[PDB]
């Protein structure tokens, strides 16, 4: 009886890769691959404690550009630090962390056990994170590189694998619900929420009082651990199809830092959506009922051939990943 759940429009199915036709695009610059191979080759030769498979990091950025199409732009190599754990040199906010394994070819593939362990790590972060909603937390990307050096060229086989939670969020438009006019609620409905900038998303959580009115809460409020929560609010997107909205829903469903979620995926929870294109927020009832630990995954690979002498160009390599429940890349060129 907290709100009316009668559907006021078509159901929508939300997922990270919905807008991109289930396609994940990876762009990798030749320069960072050249630095990765250069660093790897020195260790394997002029150094003796080199493990046969070197462990490095590539650093990328997550961009969303045409109808919510997600692209990872990988352009930085990072050997990483040892602390006993292997971590990047300096983690920048907005960095996609891609573990890079490479080995000199002599005399490679992703297995489901490797995908499974990556997804366990992914969901453990979703359950335990205390940070703001981040789309980068919704995918785990890895690269295997096999390289060879001869007198003529450097050759590299680059294989990339990803795991993404498969959960679909069912979203139903509902009638508007009264919001207590706190300062946060007033600033979200105010004139400043009308902009046109990319990656200006923010989100929080929705509490409820004795009068069954909604209270908006910042994502950093320490009371979130036990305040009774009924859903989320999202600001700075054009529509509900933005993958950030699904990311906030997933984060709310998975988080074990929120111990008093009296409305969740089984009962349906509320989304107060402040879009950038409308003066008033949209109200949705979101639900999830499928398998919680199911994931999509697949791999893609391509060869690159590099001259010994580097050319000051911006050459890059594009990989297309359309993962599914069965591990098949459903991309056809």
Automatic annotation (TrEMBL):
Q: Which domain of life is it from?
A: Eukaryota
Annotated ranges, domain STIL N-terminal: 2-323
Protein name per Swiss-Prot or TrEMBL: STIL N-terminal domain-containing protein
Q: Where the shown chain sits in the full protein? A: 13 to 348 of 836
